[PDB]
Amino acid sequence: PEAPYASLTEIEHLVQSVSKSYRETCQLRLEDLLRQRSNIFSREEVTGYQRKSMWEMWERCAHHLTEAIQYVVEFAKRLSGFMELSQNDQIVLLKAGAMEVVLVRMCRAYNADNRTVFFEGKYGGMELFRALGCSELISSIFDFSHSLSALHFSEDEIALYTALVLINAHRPGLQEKRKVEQLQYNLELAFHHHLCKTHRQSILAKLPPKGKLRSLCSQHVERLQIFQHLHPIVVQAAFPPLYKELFS
Ligand SMILES: Cc1c(CN2CCN(C(=O)C3CCCC3)[C@@H](C)C2)cc(F)cc1NC(=O)c1cccc(C#N)c1
Ligand SMILES: O=C(O)c1ccc(-c2nn(C(=O)c3c(Cl)cccc3C(F)(F)F)c3cccc(F)c23)c(F)c1
């Protein structure tokens, strides 16, 4: 809801609702990603990935990213007020924000102890993705996940943070900007309430600087678009109007 004078009841139900939506749209539970940290690709398995073609690695990565986006879109549609927005406004928020949320969620699958990430059943370093020839971009994604891992987000914290990545009234092309401002205001009030209540306000000053996530997402999506133009993946679109905006 967008209503003014959001009560303590509304705010705490917004926290619970967003956290449930987050937990139920994760590909794997946090406890399963943590329990798989000891399951690491052997040097033989890493060499097998490195000897794959650029196009086979592109297909594997693109497949995972398509699924990650689709989960974020499920998450967005569960956020209160989102499905009451116009289709234009839903697509404006997702086109910018969906990959930004995917990039934030990646930190759950990042192990800062040995700089590995979960990929197709085991953990491996960035040398696993050598065949793609995107060493600088993948290095920036690892760095960003490392910076987010240092915050030690609770499930509530990462849920509210990613809800605010999506429900942002400053995306160009919104026709109901005032309505999204009111939704965002209430999410910010919930986020700040929750952080104050749990004595975790110290994380606010440590969140990624204004524009860093947007910039990383821009570099990432630019690269994905170039790969798609040169070797298009065939996606069965779960959300055809959104798909048309990104793949046309
Ligand atoms: C794989 C992974 C990377 C590295 N990876 C390199 C290739 N990529 C590109 O975009 C390439 C660069 C442009 C062309 C393709 C991304 C997929 C990122 C970093 C990271 F921080 C976390 C992850 N893993 C997950 O997040 C994950 C995987 C499976 C299940 C779950 C869950 N639940 C999470
Ligand atoms: O209807 C669907 O099921 C659907 C699934 C994924 C997206 C999607 N893709 N995407 C890519 O960057 C991407 C991916 Cl994940 C893989 C290969 C090629 C691409 C390309 F770069 F071409 F868009 C996005 C970026 C931002 C916001 C998005 F919503 C997407 C989409 F728009 C719709």
From Swiss-Prot:
Highest taxon above the source species: Eukaryota
Stated induction or repression of this protein's expression: Up-regulated in the state of obesity.
Tissue specificity as recorded in UniProt: Isoform 1 is widely expressed in many tissues, including liver and adipose, and highly expressed in skeletal muscle. Isoform 2 is primarily expressed in immature thymocytes.
Compartments where located: Nucleus
Position of sequence motif AF-2: 242-247
NR LBD domain sequence ranges: 10-248
Pathology linked to this chain's protein: Immunodeficiency 42: An autosomal recessive primary immunodeficiency characterized by increased susceptibility to concomitant candidiasis and mycobacteriosis. Candidiasis is characterized by persistent and/or recurrent infections of the skin, nails and mucous membranes caused by organisms of the genus Candida. Mycobacteriosis is characterized by infections caused by moderately virulent mycobacterial species, such as Bacillus Calmette-Guerin (BCG) vaccine, environmental non-tuberculous mycobacteria, and by the more virulent Mycobacterium tuberculosis.
Function comment: Nuclear receptor that binds DNA as a monomer to ROR response elements (RORE) containing a single core motif half-site 5'-AGGTCA-3' preceded by a short A-T-rich sequence. Key regulator of cellular differentiation, immunity, peripheral circadian rhythm as well as lipid, steroid, xenobiotics and glucose metabolism. Considered to have intrinsic transcriptional activity, have some natural ligands like oxysterols that act as agonists (25-hydroxycholesterol) or inverse agonists (7-oxygenated sterols), enhancing or repressing the transcriptional activity, respectively.
Family: Belongs to the nuclear hormone receptor family. NR1 subfamily.
Domain remark from Swiss-Prot or TrEMBL: The AF-2 (activation function-2) motif is required for recruiting coregulators containing LXXLL motifs such as NCOA1 and NCOA2.
SUBUNIT field: Interacts (via AF-2 motif) with the coactivator NCOA2 (via LXXLL motif). Interacts with the corepressor NCOR1. Interacts with CRY1. Interacts (via AF-2 motif) with the coactivators NCOA1 and PPARGC1A (via LXXLL motif). Interacts (via AF-2 motif) with PROX1. Interacts with FOXP3. Interacts with NR0B2.
Protein name: Nuclear receptor ROR-gamma
Organism of derivation: Homo sapiens
Residues of the full protein shown: 260 to 507 of 518
